[PDB]
Amino acid sequence: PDPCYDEHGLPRRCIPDFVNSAFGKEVKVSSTCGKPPSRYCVVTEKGEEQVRSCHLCNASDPKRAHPPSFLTDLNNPHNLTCWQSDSYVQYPHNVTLTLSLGKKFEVTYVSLQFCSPRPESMAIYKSMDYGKTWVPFQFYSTQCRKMYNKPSRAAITKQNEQEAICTDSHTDVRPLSGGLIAFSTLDGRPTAHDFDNSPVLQDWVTATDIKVTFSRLHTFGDARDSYFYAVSDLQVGGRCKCNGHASRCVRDRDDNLVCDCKHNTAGPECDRCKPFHYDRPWQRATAREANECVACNCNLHARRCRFNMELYKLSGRKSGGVCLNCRHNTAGRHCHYCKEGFYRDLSKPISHRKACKECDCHPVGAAGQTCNQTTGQCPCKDGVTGITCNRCAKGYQQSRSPIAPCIKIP
Amino acid sequence: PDPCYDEHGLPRRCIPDFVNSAFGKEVKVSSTCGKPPSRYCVVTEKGEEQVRSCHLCNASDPKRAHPPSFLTDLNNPHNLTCWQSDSYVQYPHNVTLTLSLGKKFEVTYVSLQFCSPRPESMAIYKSMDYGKTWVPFQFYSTQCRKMYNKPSRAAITKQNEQEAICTDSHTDVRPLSGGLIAFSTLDGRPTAHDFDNSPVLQDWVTATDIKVTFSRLHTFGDRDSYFYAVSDLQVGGRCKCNGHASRCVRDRDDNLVCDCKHNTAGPECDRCKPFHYDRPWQRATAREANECVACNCNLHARRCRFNMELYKLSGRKSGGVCLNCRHNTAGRHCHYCKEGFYRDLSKPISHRKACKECDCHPVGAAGQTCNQTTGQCPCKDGVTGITCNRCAKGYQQSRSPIAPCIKIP
Numbered sequence: 033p034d035p036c037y038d039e040h041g042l043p044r045r046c047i048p049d050f051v052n053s054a055f056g057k058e059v060k061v062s063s064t065c066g067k068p069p070s071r072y073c074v075v076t077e078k079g080e081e082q083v084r085s086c087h088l089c090n091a092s093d094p095k096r097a098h099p100p101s102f103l104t105d106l107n108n109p110h111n112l113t114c115w116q117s118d119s120y121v122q123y124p125h126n127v128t129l130t131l132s133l134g135k136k137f138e139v140t141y142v143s144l145q146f147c148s149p150r151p152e153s154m155a156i157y158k159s160m161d162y163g164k165t166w167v168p169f170q171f172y173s174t175q176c177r178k179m180y181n182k183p184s185r186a187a188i189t190k191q192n193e194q195e196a197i198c199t200d201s202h203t204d205v206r207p208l209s210g211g212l213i214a215f216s217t218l219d220g221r222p223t224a225h226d227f228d229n230s231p232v233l234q235d236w237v238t239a240t241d242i243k244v245t246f247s248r249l250h251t252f253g254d255a256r257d258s259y260f261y262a263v264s265d266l267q268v269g270g271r272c273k274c275n276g277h278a279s280r281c282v283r284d285r286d287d288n289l290v291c292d293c294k295h296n297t298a299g300p301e302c303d304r305c306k307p308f309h310y311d312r313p314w315q316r317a318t319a320r321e322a323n324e325c326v327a328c329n330c331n332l333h334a335r336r337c338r339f340n341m342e343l344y345k346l347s348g349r350k351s352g353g354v355c356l357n358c359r360h361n362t363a364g365r366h367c368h369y370c371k372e373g374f375y376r377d378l379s380k381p382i383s384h385r386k387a388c389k390e391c392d393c394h395p396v397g398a399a400g401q402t403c404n405q406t407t408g409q410c411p412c413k414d415g416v417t418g419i420t421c422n423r424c425a426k427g428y429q430q431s432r433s434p435i436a437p438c439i440k441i442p
Numbered sequence: 443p444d445p446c447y448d449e450h451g452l453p454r455r456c457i458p459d460f461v462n463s464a465f466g467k468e469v470k471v472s473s474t475c476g477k478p479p480s481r482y483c484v485v486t487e488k489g490e491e492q493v494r495s496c497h498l499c500n501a502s503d504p505k506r507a508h509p510p511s512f513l514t515d516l517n518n519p520h521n522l523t524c525w526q527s528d529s530y531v532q533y534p535h536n537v538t539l540t541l542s543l544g545k546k547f548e549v550t551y552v553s554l555q556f557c558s559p560r561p562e563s564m565a566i567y568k569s570m571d572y573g574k575t576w577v578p579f580q581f582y583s584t585q586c587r588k589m590y591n592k593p594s595r596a597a598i599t600k601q602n603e604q605e606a607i608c609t610d611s612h613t614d615v616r617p618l619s620g621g622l623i624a625f626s627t628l629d630g631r632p633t634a635h636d637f638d639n640s641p642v643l644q645d646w647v648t649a650t651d652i653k654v655t656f657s658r659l660h661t662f663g664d665r666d667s668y669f670y671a672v673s674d675l676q677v678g679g680r681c682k683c684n685g686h687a688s689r690c691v692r693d694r695d696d697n698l699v700c701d702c703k704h705n706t707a708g709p710e711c712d713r714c715k716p717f718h719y720d721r722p723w724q725r726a727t728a729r730e731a732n733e734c735v736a737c738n739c740n741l742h743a744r745r746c747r748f749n750m751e752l753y754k755l756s757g758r759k760s761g762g763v764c765l766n767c768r769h770n771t772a773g774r775h776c777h778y779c780k781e782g783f784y785r786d787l788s789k790p791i792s793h794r795k796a797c798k799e800c801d802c803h804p805v806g807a808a809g810q811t812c813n814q815t816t817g818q819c820p821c822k823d824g825v826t827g828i829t830c831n832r833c834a835k836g837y838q839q840s841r842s843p844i845a846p847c848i849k850i851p
């Protein structure tokens with residue numbers, strides 16, 4: 033049924049399961065072979081020396097086309113799907129790959145599979161916006177300094193666990209094909225063991241759009257070959273960012289993947305609370321503490337509320353909701369009292385739809401039109417008694433005077 | 443298509459076709475031949491002189507039984523189905539036959555059949571209830587007075603189209619067998635030509651359960667075993683759906699009830715369906731199908747009610763009204779933002795989040811209530827704007843926690 037609530041329906045974290053992020057989707061790139069129909073040469077070794085094949089690329093030749101569809105497709109380890117670039121390209125030039133998702137995500141695995149050898153210098157980007165701003169992610173190079181002005185294999189400081197290192201490790205060839213690079217962002221971070229309480233890291237994992245640019249690749253020797261770029265498939269793992277408030281993500285009314293935000297949360301990412309849940313501040317539900325949102329109490333007399341920080345602060349960290357436009361002649365933070373003109377119908381429940389009633393005070397026996405809104409005792413004058421001030425008191429006789437009804441007796 | 447809807451799908455009055463009613467139904471009766479096996483004599487007129495035969499009845503004798511199925515079966519004019527009663531019985535006795543239906547009907551004609559001679563005295567009953575209360579109709583006897591305290595062949599006054607007349611017609615023998623009795627309720631009624639606008643006649647046709655009593659039979663001779671007998675019964679009708687259901691269907695508790703279309707409810711289409719009471723229920727007329735009509739809630743309620751004064755004061759126009767307005771709704775159609783939210787004019791008129799909060803400036807607006815129509819918040823003294831955020835012409839803004847706008851020279 034619902035994993036968002038525990039055995040006893042207790043609100044517990046419900047999460048979309050781990051899935052590859054890039055599966056079956058479109059990517060905008062810089063260029064690709066076949067326009068104009070291009071060639072590319074491929075060398076193969078044997079025992080002690082080399083032998084080089086070479087081929088051509090027309091995108092209008094489907095089997096000689098090598099689209100990025102070869103990347104998002106299923107990677108058959110027995111019928112590979114090699115995408116191809118235009119050939120003869122290198123630094124200094126941006127070999128740029130773009131990606132706009134439309135939903136903010138976190139990544140765990142970053143995996144690749146090669147049809148080409150592994151280049152030397154490249155970096156990672158990301159965009160927490162929808163394709164407007166872009167920031168890098170990590171660095172990789174042999175010469176971190178001369179090319180990137182970077183240190184080789186730097187340390188991850190605790191004061192900036194958002195450090196981006198550069199290394200020459202595993203930038204090697206072999207592999208000439210099928211190279212396996214599995215970036216794990218989780219590696220090396222000293223406070224990764226408690227990521228559930230690493231919000232800056234919980235921001236480092238925040239990502240909406242992704243960009244990948246290359247310029248440099250290795251050399252050998254020394255158009256014989258048409259050096260190019262090629263890759264067989266792509267897998268990158270992550271889970272849909274619902275802040276721990278939705279077990280999956282579905283489309284919008286305008287074709288947009290959104291969370292069905294539970295735990296009283298709203299927004300495409302459960303980033304905000306659901307409306308009228310302005311009682312305690314927004315938080316993410318934790319495993320030990322259900323940080324769901326919570327609506328305001330109006331005692332069934334209003335549908336809107338707001339919040340102030342001092343309220344929760346002065347509440348000993350307990351609550352801060354307050355209702356607005358308290359109907360049924362009610363008033364208060366919980367619409368929990370009748371305003372001037374009405375009183376509390378004590379017979380009705382504490383949240384009844386007509387719990388506030390006007391004071392039907394004796395227009396003669398009561399002195400005013402206001403009754404005790406707590407008790408309902410109307411304004412009994414000098415000798416007048418009774419709740420609505422109707423009866424005369426002991427030793428007090430009713431008179432037909434429209435002003436002085438009850439009079440003491442000696 | 444649906445006969446409940448016109449050529450252009452207009453919800454035209456739909457009617458069950460005229461069909462026989464008592465075909466195949468069971469009836470509990472008082473007594474009949476065969477218990478114990480009884481005898482009975484039958485006379486035949488050979489041209490001029492007389493000859494009387496005589497027979498017996500065992501109910502446990504299938505071919506010598508005389509079951510009431512002989513009345514409900516199809517009558518072969520060449521293989522008649524003569525039911526018979528016990529013999530040695532006559533007035534004064536309620537020789538009564540009853541029937542509990544379970545569905546209200548409208549009837550026009552009444553037909554009979556005979557294997558025995560046509561007797562003299564018999565009566566009619568019915569129930570607008572389910573076999574509990576019982577009321578008569580016309581009478582048939584020689585002495586409408588001495589027996590029924592009634593006049594013979596009375597007139598059908600317009601002022602009482604509920605008159606109960608008595609006549610001697612067709613109590614004769616011959617026929618001694620194969621007697622033919624036909625009755626038309628509308629005969630004599632001056633107001634039968636406008637039955638659709640003759641509600642008393644629309645009540646005069648009301649019938650749910652039927653009872654019929656016999657007493658007398660002619661002693662023509664007059665040593666004999668006298669009885670009563672009949673070959674079949676056919677009664678045509680249409681299932682009472684007020685013109686709002688084209689038929690009647692069986693219920694989940696075995697109840698042949700109207701499939702009430704035209705927004706009508708009740709086993710007879712006599713009432714409106716729940717949430718179908720904008721104008722009260724009425725019966726489909728030849729001029730107007732007077733169908734029921736739902737309440738208007740603009741997608742903002744689950745229950746509704748009605749008051750006639752609304753329809754009264756509407757110049758005969760409308761009157762539905764909703765209950766329990768959820769999802770930021772309130773009103774007769776739950777059709778306004780309550781003392782609370784305001785109207786998001788950009789959003790459609792019936793959205794589940796249509797009403798929008800009065801986001802009044804906690805400083806720049808004075809009160810917490812906005813002109814929920816215009817959303818105009820309480821702009822203070824130099825403040826303008828809907829939520830009262832801007833200062834007005836000639837007003838200097840201050841960061842004061844109370845008074846932002848200051849007049850300018």
Ligand SMILES: *[C@@H]1O[C@H](CO)[C@@H](O[C@@H]2O[C@H](CO)[C@@H](O[C@@H]3O[C@H](CO[C@H]4O[C@H](CO)[C@@H](O)[C@H](O)[C@@H]4O)[C@@H](O)[C@H](O[C@H]4O[C@H](CO)[C@@H](O)[C@H](O)[C@@H]4O)[C@@H]3O)[C@H](O)[C@H]2NC(C)=O)[C@H](O)[C@H]1NC(C)=O
Nearest residue numbers: 065066067068069070088089090091092093094095096097
């Ligand atoms: C990209 O890579 C792909 C696959 O390798 C190549 O695909 C070719 O696409 C063309 C489309 O034009 C096709 O060529 C076909 O062969 C014909 C040979 O010429 C004879 O044509 C007929 C018999 O087919 C004879 O009657 C005639 O007298 C010629 O002797 C072409 O002429 C045809 O192309 C014609 O079709 C297009 C519409 O499709 C018309 O607009 C033109 O008039 C054009 O002449 C015929 O369709 C075939 O599908 C592929 N040919 C191959 C693989 O050899 C692309 O050629 C390649 N891109 C480039 C730029 O070469």
Ligand SMILES: *[C@@H]1O[C@H](CO)[C@@H](O[C@@H]2O[C@H](CO)[C@@H](O[C@@H]3O[C@H](CO[C@H]4O[C@H](CO)[C@@H](O)[C@H](O)[C@@H]4O)[C@@H](O)[C@H](O[C@H]4O[C@H](CO)[C@@H](O)[C@H](O)[C@@H]4O)[C@@H]3O)[C@H](O)[C@H]2NC(C)=O)[C@H](O)[C@H]1NC(C)=O
Nearest residue numbers: 475476477478479480498499500501502503504505506507
């Ligand atoms: C009402 O109308 C019906 C229909 O016409 C008549 O139905 C009778 O039904 C009985 C039912 O039993 C029939 O009786 C039959 O005749 C036998 C005569 O007795 C001899 O039985 C055998 C030969 O059959 C001999 O060996 C024996 O020595 C007797 O000489 C009855 O004995 C039979 O009935 C027996 O069978 C039932 C089970 O079926 C047993 O439980 C009993 O022991 C019972 O005795 C045999 O069935 C008879 O034929 C029918 N009569 C007809 C068709 O005319 C009723 O008779 C009638 N009512 C009256 C009051 O007459």
Ligand SMILES: *[C@@H]1O[C@H](CO)[C@@H](O[C@@H]2O[C@H](CO)[C@@H](O)[C@H](O)[C@H]2NC(C)=O)[C@H](O)[C@H]1NC(C)=O
Nearest residue numbers: 062124125126127128129166243244245246247
């Ligand atoms: C290569 O570098 C970056 C992207 O990797 C691009 O940056 C450009 O910088 C100039 C500097 O004034 C701007 O005018 C351009 O608008 C930027 N390009 C954008 C924003 O797309 C640069 O254009 C790239 N060169 C290419 C792709 O040929």
Ligand SMILES: *[C@@H]1O[C@H](CO)[C@@H](O[C@@H]2O[C@H](CO)[C@@H](O)[C@H](O)[C@H]2NC(C)=O)[C@H](O)[C@H]1NC(C)=O
Nearest residue numbers: 472534535536537538565567576653654655656
């Ligand atoms: C004949 O007439 C009616 C039914 O046609 C019966 O009326 C009964 O009246 C007595 C009066 O005290 C009541 O106690 C009975 O309950 C009535 N019976 C009904 C209503 O069924 C009358 O009994 C009939 N006579 C019979 C059947 O022998």
Ligand SMILES: *[C@@H]1O[C@H](CO)[C@@H](O)[C@H](O)[C@H]1NC(C)=O
Nearest residue numbers: 094095096108110111112113
């Ligand atoms: C791989 O699949 C493609 C898709 O049709 C097919 O054309 C090709 O022949 C397959 N590979 C081999 C070796 O057959």
Ligand SMILES: *[C@@H]1O[C@H](CO)[C@@H](O)[C@H](O)[C@H]1NC(C)=O
Nearest residue numbers: 403404405406407408409410
């Ligand atoms: C109303 O009645 C209560 C009951 O004791 C009393 O304490 C109070 O003073 C009265 N007046 C109010 C609440 O204004």
Ligand SMILES: *[C@@H]1O[C@H](CO)[C@@H](O)[C@H](O)[C@H]1NC(C)=O
Nearest residue numbers: 504505518519520521522523
């Ligand atoms: C009438 O039908 C019944 C059916 O059982 C049959 O027994 C009887 O002999 C028939 N009689 C005539 C006259 O057709």
Ligand SMILES: *[C@@H]1O[C@H](CO)[C@@H](O)[C@H](O)[C@H]1NC(C)=O
Nearest residue numbers: 812813814815816817818819
């Ligand atoms: C609400 O706005 C209308 C629109 O001009 C205005 O006429 C009215 O005075 C405002 N206040 C109300 C209706 O209380």
